[PDB]
Design a protein around this nucleic acid. Structure first.
Lengths: 111, 42, 42, 56
RNA sequence: AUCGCUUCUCGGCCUUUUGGCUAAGAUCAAGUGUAGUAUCUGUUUAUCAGUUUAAUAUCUGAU
């Protein structure tokens, strides 16, 4: 039972985000009884996120609305987290606190 | 210049890899760079 | 409640061919441009 | 025209003074610069053709 | 019309099928002129006259 430190912050955020999504609707707003395809709604979730990042308008042809609202809600969650981290690291880089060399490149790419 | 063989490779390459992996496709082709492949497609 | 499958433009984990059409699918101009441009010509 | 061209090409060379690890695309640019430094009238003919006809 | 068997056609399942994340994780590709090396591949035209040679061969000449 190892803690969540600094190298596992992102991987853990995604662990818990997609655990939450799987709890959320794909088992508590179903009635796609047979096999609720949750492993494929998670694929839509990851692709909606990449489409956010690329600034592409994402719209899937026939996809029930409750799912689409669930996905839009969770992509806004991850987007808030992502850009708040960018603001924070940019202030650290500007005033001079970190010299880590992965944060400098990650942050230039975010901004 | 562009030769029908090549752009017929490019149609299939885009059909397979996707519309965002231009360096892979560019590697399928001899004497083409990813910039020119992307330009020809668009 | 049927869920369409995702075909991404970035991930092709199993290397599958999808036709260009299905691969693909998954502007405004004001009216003051006319008044500006014609005022300039005059 | 040749004085203006020599100045342009010297300015463009000034980037890769180091002659570093550059890449394919800078390799290609250096190729264009050298062949225009050798044959300065096909260069200028091209240049004025561009300035006259190209808009995309 | 009913029952059964066979033949072809069609619909429905066909989730039973796209391992997670980041800074699309990051990046990029140049050439055959010279020689040689190695491997395979092919081989060790018919008399006769002479030259020659230890003997062959070679060489020359018609086939």
């Amino acid at each position: 039972a190892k803690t969540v430190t600094k190298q596992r912050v992102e991987s853990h955020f995604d662990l818990e985000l997609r655990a939450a999504v799987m709890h959320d609707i794909l088992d508590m707003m179903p009635e796609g009884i047979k096999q609720n395809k949750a492993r494929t709604i998670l694929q839509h979730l990851s692709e909606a996120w990449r489409c956010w990042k690329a600034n592409i308008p994402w719209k899937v042809p026939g996809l029930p609305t409750p799912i689409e609202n669930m996905i839009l809600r969770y992509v806004k969650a991850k987007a808030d987290w992502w850009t708040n981290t960018a603001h924070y690291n940019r202030e650290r880089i500007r005033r001079g606190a970190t010299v880590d060399k992965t944060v400098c490149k990650k942050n230039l790419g975010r901004l | 210049v562009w030769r029908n063989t090549e752009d017929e490779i490019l149609k299939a390459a885009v059909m397979k890899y996707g519309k965002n992996q231009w360096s892979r496709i560019a590697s399928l082709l001899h004497r083409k760079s990813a910039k020119q492949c992307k330009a020809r497609w668009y | 409640w049927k869920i369409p499958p995702c075909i991404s433009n970035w991930k092709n984990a199993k290397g599958y061919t999808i036709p260009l059409d299905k691969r693909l699918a998954a502007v405004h101009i004001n009216e003051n441009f006319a008044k500006l441009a014609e005022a300039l010509y005059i | 025209d040749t004085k203006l061209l020599i100045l342009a090409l010297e300015r463009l060379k000034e980037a890769y003074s180091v002659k570093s690890r550059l890449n394919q695309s800078q390799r290609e640019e250096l190729g264009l610069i050298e062949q225009a430094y050798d044959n300065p009238h096909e260069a200028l003919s091209r240049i004025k053709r561009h300035l006259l006809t190209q808009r995309a």
